[PDB]
Write a protein that binds this ligand. Structure first.
Ligand code: FMN
Ligand code: FMN
Lengths: 216, 216
């Protein structure tokens, strides 16, 4: 069941480059990225899915030099996903989101729609104006998406590793992200592990629930 | 089929208070919280799982003021999880983590263990001493945990809603979290939706991939 998946999945240390996602799989990973939940359905994200050798090479520039171990993971894997967050939440994005909810039939009336818009605007304005944490707020949503994604791709029977070990300034510049209003946070190579993946056979380690968990 | 799960899950707006998790389910949700990944296996989190009437009422003090719409969700669900992040990363936590990985048998040699420790410390130091973003870094891991959790609980056939709409100051004070070194980020009621959950029958809405996703 899904608990088997949770207990069996791992962070892949090495990928077999000859194993490629099926066409179906390549679509499903995109479906996972798209359908993650987010606060206010704000969806404050951009994904780059590199499946060509040259696409993956562009992402792997971000690891060259200081993050050399990350480099190979990015090149060997079939598909490599860069999760990016918005750097600012603009009125244009807020309107885009509510108008899509409208188009998808989520509002019975014009009043329902305007209430939804107003509530989202209030939440966004609070983060920006008062808490001064809108960048962080949006990045948190991208991380939630990542969590969703790692379980999803494990459940598809795929291997993956989340990577913070890359240079976001280099990745941002490689893809012109800053001027488009995004920044790269996590890279996730997806594929099938090789026999050089020593982590595939190691026991999983987590702290005991008596440390991390209180029942009331 | 995890894709079906992702496409069919939703944020529950109303719970049937008579429908409780099975005993086995109550254990599975705890397994999902525990076995999420995190950067460096840093596991910078504390969970409160409220399953009693008194426990849920304590959590629902946080649904005051602007957040009164969260109150019923927190009270009527079977189980309510509070995701908390550490407020600071300490060397004691770092040691706790590596010693657990050692106990679980992740390290062939003393050198392997010390290399793992030193790598974790470098990453942690970069956050807390250079970037000064360790609070955000750890919160991002908690949000990853949340995303894993929402898909997992949906795959168990359970309903849930992630809530940022609560007063963290009140929830923190109610549970003495600040002095214990934690703060509350997301509340997730888990259970079964009622026929009043209007969101169960509404269409799901996301932005189109031609906005959110580039293939390279
Ligand atoms: C946000 C994030 C960043 C990570 N960055 C790296 C990375 O840069 N390199 C790496 O080898 N593993 C990385 N990991 C993998 C973790 O070490 C791993 O998730 C953790 O040790 C738990 O093991 P598991 O993923 O096999 O359950 C990262 C994990 C997460 C969640
Ligand atoms: C971090 C987070 C916080 C949220 N906070 C709330 C909340 O306080 N109240 C609420 O009714 N829904 C809340 N939501 C639900 C979102 O509106 C929902 O995820 C989004 O509209 C997408 O719809 P879906 O979850 O049904 O796919 C939250 C979602 C997330 C991811």
């Amino acid at each position: 069941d899904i608990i088997s998946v949770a207990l069996k999945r791992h962070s892949t240390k090495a990928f077999d480059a000859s194993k490629k996602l099926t066409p179906e799989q390549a679509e499903q990973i995109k479906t996972l990225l798209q359908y993650s939940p987010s606060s206010q359905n704000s969806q404050p994200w951009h994904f780059i899915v590199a499946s060509t050798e040259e696409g993956k090479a562009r992402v792997a520039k971000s690891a060259a030099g200081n993050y050399v171990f990350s480099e190979r993971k990015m090149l060997d894997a079939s598909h490599v996903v860069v999760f990016c967050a918005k750097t600012a939440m603009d009125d244009v994005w807020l309107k885009l989101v509510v108008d899509q909810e409208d188009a998808d039939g989520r509002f019975a009336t014009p009043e329902a729609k305007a209430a939804n818009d107003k509530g989202r605007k209030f939440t966004a304005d609070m983060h920006r104006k008062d808490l001064h944490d809108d960048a962080e707020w949006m990045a948190k949503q991208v991380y939630l998406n990542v969590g969703n994604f790692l379980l999803g791709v494990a459940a598809l029977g795929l291997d993956a590793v989340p990577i913070e070990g890359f240079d976001a300034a280099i990745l941002d510049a490689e893809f012109g992200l800053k001027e488009k209003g995004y920044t790269s946070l996590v890279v996730v190579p997806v594929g099938h592990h090789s026999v050089e993946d020593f982590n595939a056979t190691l026991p999983k380690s987590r702290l005991p629930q008596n440390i991390t968990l209180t029942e009331v």
